[PDB]
RNA sequence: AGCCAGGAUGUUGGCUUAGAAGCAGCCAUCAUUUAAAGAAAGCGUAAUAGCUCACUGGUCGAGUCGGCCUGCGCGGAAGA
RNA sequence: CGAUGUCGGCUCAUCACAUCCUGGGGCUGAAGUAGGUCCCAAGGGUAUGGCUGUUCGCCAUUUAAAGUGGUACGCGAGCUG
C-alpha cells in the first residue's frame, strides 16, 4: 500500500482538482491504463487494482504505477462537533485529472494486457481507457 | 482460410501433375471414414497413384490447361482425384474394388487420351493389365 | 432465473434476447445460465 | 428480407383469393385464412406469390418476411398437411382417442380429457403414442404444447409427455 | 507516399482553433528553412488514418496547400488527452 | 469391442485383463491360451497390443499388433520407467541406428510412406517421455 | 448463417493411481496419413465406450463480420 | 423557551413493502417429504406466558405464521404513571 516515507507537513488544505493531466503518454511500457474521469485514487484502490492485474499476467512481464498517493486526507469521527482543530490523517489519495496514465505494462501480448487492465479497472472509482505506446 | 497465394499454389501443384500423369480417375468420397482412406492412400502410393481432394472450383482451373477439359461436368459434388504418374491404369482398378467393398459413393468419371468416359463405361481402364504384358 | 444489472453471455449456447424491453440471457445447454436484467 | 424476397410457388389444385390484406388458401387438405399486416403488400401473378414492403411503413421487410413464411406453411398446410407426434414415458401412462377427445391417464386422481379444436385430428397407433394431423402449423403446434403441458418431461427419469423428436436430458439426484 | 491536402488558415488563436476541431478539422504548422512559417488546417478523419501507420513519422510526406506541393517530415504531434484524436501537428520542411 | 495390452507370455491374472474384458461376454480360458500360443515368437518382457472383435453369439476374433512406440523406447535406452517431467528431466539416450530399429518393426501399424516418415513418428514419442536423441 | 460428410494414425503420449485410454492432476505438446482433425474446447464412464466442437471437402448463391468517432433512447430504479 | 408534556404499557389504529404465513413462478449442490435462493404478489391473516419500568432480549409452550418499517420513536383536551 503506497504512502510517502516522510513529509514536510502532516495535514494538507483541501484544494481543488481542476485542469488536464500531465503525463499522458505510455513512457516506460508498451501498454497503459489512462484516466478518462476526474477524481481521487486512494492507496487501497491503487493496491486493489495492482493486485488484480498482477494475478492476471501470472507475474510475467513488468508493471509500473505512474501515480503516487502523496495527498493526506483528514476525517472527523462520530459524535464530534465542528471546529476544535483539523481532523486526523486517515488515508492518502492521488489527485487524478483526465488523461493520466495510471498503470503501464510490457512483456505480455496485447490480448492479455487488455484483460489484465479490464480486471483492474473494476477496482477503480474513475473511468479508464486502454492506451498503446506511440511513435512521438 | 485459403489465401489466393495458397489457391494459386494448389492450382499449380495439380496443373504440373496433370501434364505428367497418364490415367486420371475422378470420384465421390462422402461418408467414408479416414481409416478406409489412409488405407486407399497406402494402396495408391504403392501403385504410383497420386491421391488428392481439391475444391471443384480450383479443379476447373488446373484442368483448363488441357487435356482433361472434359472432366468439367465431373466437378459437382465431393471430388477425389487419382492421377496415375507411373503406368496407365492402376487407380481405375484400385477404385472399382474399393467402391464395391465399401458400398459408399458411386465414382463420377474416368479420363484417358484427352477423352471423356461415362460412369457406365469405366470397365475400359479396369480390364487393362501391365506394361509389362506385351512380352 | 438470475435477476441482476449486468446480464452477460456465459457459454457459447447463451443467446441475448429482448422480450418486452427486458434484456434476457436465454440458454439451451445450461438452465443455470438463464438471466433477466433487473 | 432474404425470406420475403424468396417466392411461394402455389401448386396445381391450390386456389388463392386476395381481398386487400385478407388471404384465403383452398386446397385438398382444407381451407385457411389469414389477415396480413398493413405494412405487407402481396402480389399474385403466375403460379407464384411475391411479398414486399408498403411505402411509408418502417418495419416493412420484417413484416413482409413473416407474411411469406406464414403463407408458405399455409400452402403446405392445404396440400401435404402437418404432423406432430408425442410419446408418453412412465409407468401407468396411457392415452386413447374417442373422436375429437384425447383421453390421457397421467398419474392424476382424475383422467385428463383434452378436446381438440377445428381442423386438428388425432390417432393412437399405441397406448403410448399420440399423432396429430391438420392444416394450420400454428394450431397443431399449440395442441401439441397443451398436451405436453399436462406432464412436462421430468429431469430425473424423463417421465412425461414428450415430442417424438424431443431430447430429454436427465440428471442424478443429490449425493447424500 | 503520403499525400495530405490542406488550406491556409484565415484566422489564428484559441476561439478559431476550437472552432476547427468542432468542425472535424485541426490546425497544424509548417516551418523550417528561409521560408516564413505556414499556418494550415487539416481534415481530421483523413490525417488520423494516415498517422496510424508508423511510416508516417519516418518518411517524407507531401502537403498540397492550394495547388502547391510542399515536402515535409512530421516533427511534433499534439494528441487529445484521452480520446483517439489529434489536436495539432508540427511539420518541418524537408 | 475393446482394446488391451497384455504381456508376450502372460495372460490370465484378475487385476489387468480379468473383469475388464470378461464383463462384455468373452471366455476367460479360451482367449488366455490362444493368445500366448501365437505370441510365443515375441521376445520375453515386451508388452504386445491386441484388439478384440466380439459378435452377438459371444464368439471372438483377434488380430495381434506390433509393440507400442512408448514401450520399445524403454528397452532401447535401458530404462524401466519414463520421466515424470519430460524435456525437463533426461532419463536416457538413443542413437539414430536405434530409431530406425523401432520404426522397421512398427512398419505394419504406421501410417508413413517412407523410412524417414516412420522415424520422425518415433522421434516425437521419445521427446514426450524425457528421452533425448544422442 | 443453415444443411450433407469426415473429425484419423503412432497412441491407452509419459509420469501418477485400484483406474487416468483427449477429458482428477502434473509435465511435454511433436510427428504421420492429410481436404482437414488440438497428443484435444465441453458434457459423459469405475476406467473404456458414446455425443459434439476447433478445422476441412460438398451444397447454396450474394453479401457478411466487429472495432472506431458520434446523436437520441433502454435496463440499473423499493416507502410510508 | 409570553410552554410543541418525556419512556414503556392499555385502548384504538392507518399506511409502505425491503413479504413472516397463505397464493403463483424460475434456478437448485430440487428423487419423494422437506429445504435453499431469487422473481411476482400487500387480499386477508400474523401467540399466550415466566423475568424485568422496559421497548428489546433471554427463556417456556404454542401457531400456517408469531414479518420489517412510516404515522410528533402514531395515540395523556383518551386512560395509566
Ligand atoms: Mg410477457
Ligand atoms: Mg474564450
Ligand atoms: Mg458455411
Ligand atoms: Mg402562545
Ligand atoms: Mg416486492
Ligand atoms: Mg443474494
Ligand atoms: Mg397486511
Ligand atoms: Mg407467579
Ligand atoms: Mg415457527
Ligand atoms: Mg410517540
Ligand atoms: Mg387526564
Ligand atoms: Zn449458457
Curated annotation (Swiss-Prot), chain B:
A GO biological-process term: cytoplasmic translation
Family, similarity comment: Belongs to the universal ribosomal protein uL10 family.
Protein's recorded name: Large ribosomal subunit protein uL10
Domain of life: Bacteria
Additional facts recorded: Ribosomal protein L8 appears to be an aggregate of ribosomal proteins L7/L12 and L10.
Function recorded in the entry: Forms part of the ribosomal stalk, playing a central role in the interaction of the ribosome with GTP-bound translation factors. Protein L10 is also a translational repressor protein. It controls the translation of the rplJL-rpoBC operon by binding to its mRNA.
Positions of disulphide bridges: none
One of the record's GO cellular component terms: cytosol
Species name: Escherichia coli (strain K12)
Positions bearing N6-acetyllysine: 36, 104
From Swiss-Prot, chain C:
A GO MF label: structural constituent of ribosome
Domain of life according to the entry: Bacteria
Cellular component, GO, one term: cytosolic large ribosomal subunit
Record bears the keyword Metal-binding: no
Any Pfam family matching the protein: Ribosomal_L36
Keyword entries, A-Z: Ribonucleoprotein, Ribosomal protein, RNA-binding, rRNA-binding
InterPro entries assigned: Ribosomal_bL36 (IPR000473), Ribosomal_bL36_sp (IPR035977)
GO biological process: cytoplasmic translation; translation
Nucleotidyltransferase as UniProt keyword: no
Complex and partners: Part of the 50S ribosomal subunit.
Task of the protein: One of the last ribosomal proteins to be assembled in the 50S subunit, it contacts a number of helices in the 23S rRNA, acting as molecular glue. The simultaneous presence of uL16 and bL36 probably triggers ObgE's GTPase activity and eventual dissociation from the mature 50S ribosomal subunit.
Family: Belongs to the bacterial ribosomal protein bL36 family.
The protein's name: Large ribosomal subunit protein bL36A
Upper taxonomic lineage: Bacteria, Pseudomonadati, Pseudomonadota, Gammaproteobacteria, Enterobacterales
Swiss-Prot record, chain E:
Recorded GO MF terms: 5S rRNA binding; structural constituent of ribosome
Coiled coil: none
Pfam families in the record: Ribosomal_L25p
InterPro entries (alphabetical): Rbsml_bL25/Gln-tRNA_synth_N (IPR020056), Ribosomal_bL25/Gln-tRNA_synth (IPR011035), Ribosomal_bL25_short (IPR020055), Ribosomal_L25_dom (IPR029751), Ribosomal_uL5_bac-type (IPR020930)
One cellular component (GO) term of this entry: cytoplasm
Gene3D superfamilies with a match to the protein in the record: Ribosomal Protein L25, Chain P (2.40.240.10)
GO biological process: cytoplasmic translation; negative regulation of translation; response to radiation; ribosomal large subunit assembly; translation
Annotated keywords: Ribonucleoprotein, Ribosomal protein, RNA-binding, rRNA-binding
Subunit structure: Part of the 50S ribosomal subunit; part of the 5S rRNA/L5/L18/L25 subcomplex. Contacts the 5S rRNA.
Cited function: This is one of the proteins that binds to the 5S RNA in the ribosome where it forms part of the central protuberance. Binds to the 5S rRNA independently of L5 and L18. Not required for binding of the 5S rRNA/L5/L18 subcomplex to 23S rRNA.
Family: Belongs to the bacterial ribosomal protein bL25 family.
Name the UniProt record assigns to this protein: Large ribosomal subunit protein bL25
Protein species of origin: Escherichia coli (strain K12)
UniProtKB/Swiss-Prot annotation, chain F:
Biological process annotations from GO: cytoplasmic translation; ribosomal large subunit assembly; stringent response; translation; translational termination
Modified positions (N6-succinyllysine) in chain numbering: 65, 74
Disulfide bond entries: none
InterPro entries noted in UniProt: Ribosomal_uL11, Ribosomal_uL11_bac-typ, Ribosomal_uL11_C, Ribosomal_uL11_C_sf, Ribosomal_uL11_CS, Ribosomal_uL11_N, Ribosomal_uL11_N_sf
Modified residues (N6,N6,N6-trimethyllysine): 33
Gene Ontology CC terms, in alphabetical order: cytoplasm; cytosol; cytosolic large ribosomal subunit
Keywords on record: Methylation, Ribonucleoprotein, Ribosomal protein, RNA-binding, rRNA-binding
Pfam families membership: Ribosomal_L11, Ribosomal_L11_N
GO molecular function: large ribosomal subunit rRNA binding; rRNA binding; structural constituent of ribosome
Protein task: Forms part of the ribosomal stalk which helps the ribosome interact with GTP-bound translation factors.
Subunit structure: Part of the ribosomal stalk of the 50S ribosomal subunit. Interacts with L10 and the large rRNA to form the base of the stalk. L10 forms an elongated spine to which 2 L12 dimers bind in a sequential fashion forming a pentameric L10(L12)2(L12)2 complex.
Matches recorded under PANTHER family: 60S RIBOSOMAL PROTEIN L12, LARGE RIBOSOMAL SUBUNIT PROTEIN UL11M
Protein family: Belongs to the universal ribosomal protein uL11 family.
Record-given protein name: Large ribosomal subunit protein uL11
Source species: Escherichia coli (strain K12)
Lineage per the UniProt record: Bacteria, Pseudomonadati, Pseudomonadota, Gammaproteobacteria, Enterobacterales
